Amino acid sequence: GAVVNCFSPVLIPDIWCQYFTAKLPLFAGAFPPAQGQNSTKGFNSKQGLMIHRNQNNNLVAPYLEKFADNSSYFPVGQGPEINDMATWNGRLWMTTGNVQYLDYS
């Protein structure tokens, strides 16, 4: 019963977004079936992304977008870039099962 206000605002699950939509964006797409060829993959630096890998604390992050002064703190007056490659890739790691939401450091 505790407040878990660390996500973006959700109110309805994924299937209502995905089954009712004619043309749906990339970052909110259904996960295709498990045991198939071409099943479930991600987006690496071939699509322009970069990995963070804070491996000193055994703790690595996805292939996310390039920073440009967004690394630890955002600039006063700027926020997160619309990137669908990296938001797909971030929820691709939230579904693994032991996920930490920590920091640049």
Q: Say how many residues touch another protein, by CB under 8 A.
A: 15
**99 vs 105: CA distance, rounded Å:** 16
71 belongs to the binding site for another protein (CB under 8 A) = yes
Q: How many CA atoms lie within 13 A of 35 on its CB side?
A: 0
Of these, 22, 46, 53, 103, which contacts another protein (CB under 8 A)? 103
Q: Least distance to another protein from the beta carbon of 98, Å? A: 23
Q: With contacts defined by CB under 8 A, name the span among 4-12, 40-48, 79-87, 92-100 that binds another protein.
A: 79-87
Q: Which is nearer to another protein, 11 or 82 (CB)?
A: 82
Q: Which residue among 82, 96, 98, 100 contacts another protein (CB under 8 A)?
A: 82
Beta strands in the chain (DSSP E): 50-51, 63-64
- Considering only residues 40 through 69, tell me which ones interact with another protein, judged by CB under 8 A: 69
Tell me how far apart the alpha carbons of residues 38 and 13 are, in angstroms, rounded to a whole number: 25
- The whole-angstrom separation of Cα 100 and Cα 54 is 12
Neighbours of 86 (CB within 10 A): 24
Which chain residues interact with another protein by CB under 8 A?
69, 71-79, 81-82, 103-105
